[PDB]
Design a protein around this ligand. Structure first.
Ligand SMILES: O=C(CCC(F)(F)F)N1CCC2(CC1)CC(C(F)(F)F)=NO2
Length: 205
């Protein structure tokens, strides 16, 4: 089964404590080594991680778990791939380098970067593909809240996607999504990801 960089666990302990829950029984349940959160260059089971996020959200009645966990994460969780991104010439180049090398973060993640004459914007379509996992709802929300953070780091602090899209229906509150994502958020759609207009995409880092 695919691994994912254990930086994607950053904040797990802190958030679980914030919610009054003990993180250790969850980590043991999903076969995530305790302490791996703070072990640089370590990697964890993607399947165990996505299931743990679901379990945390369900059992603590925290529908915005993944959105909230992003506050401890952002671009730095990409480790070597962040170094590459920050070195690009423009926001488009930084995001497209993340896409090219996202397998280094996890082989189960695919980013498709597309622009067409027929539609506005550059689209960043995102997929988690791993044999046998439940649909990773909390994982997708964590991924998009992280992406909004990456856009602000690479694009400057007023930078925003034009839209975020999810495959699932809205779970958390309107306020939760607006605070994490900002822009227009579309739910229940055929694709997951975000779009950036060409003005922003062309902005130098
Ligand atoms: O949080 C995750 C993955 C979480 C989960 F594994 F899917 F559960 N990230 C960070 C964001 C992203 C995927 C992995 C998307 C992205 C970009 F450039 F599109 F904005 N870079 O890394």
């Amino acid at each position: 089964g695919s691994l994912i960089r254990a930086t994607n666990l950053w904040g797990y302990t802190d958030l679980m404590r914030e919610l009054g829950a003990d993180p250790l029984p969850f980590l043991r349940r999903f076969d995530i080594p305790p302490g791996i959160e703070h072990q640089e260059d370590a990697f964890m089971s993607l399947a165990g991680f996505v299931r743990m996020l679901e379990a945390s959200a369900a059992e603590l009645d925290c529908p915005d778990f993944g959105l909230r966990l992003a506050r401890w994460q952002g671009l730095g969780i990409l480790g070597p791939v962040a170094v590459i991104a920050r070195n690009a010439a423009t926001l488009f180049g930084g995001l497209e380098a993340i896409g090219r090398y996202l397998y280094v973060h996890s082989p189960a993640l695919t980013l498709t970067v597309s622009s067409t004459t027929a539609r506005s914007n550059v689209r960043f379509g995102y997929e988690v593909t791993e044999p046998g996992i439940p649909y990773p709802l909390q994982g997708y929300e964590l991924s998009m809240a992280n992406a909004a953070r990456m856009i602000r780091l690479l694009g400057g602090p007023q930078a925003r996607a034009r839209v975020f899209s999810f495959r699932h229906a809205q779970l958390g509150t309107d306020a939760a999504y607006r605070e994490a994502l900002g822009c227009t958020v579309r739910f229940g759609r055929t694709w997951c990801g975000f779009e950036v207009d060409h003005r922003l995409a062309g902005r130098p880092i």
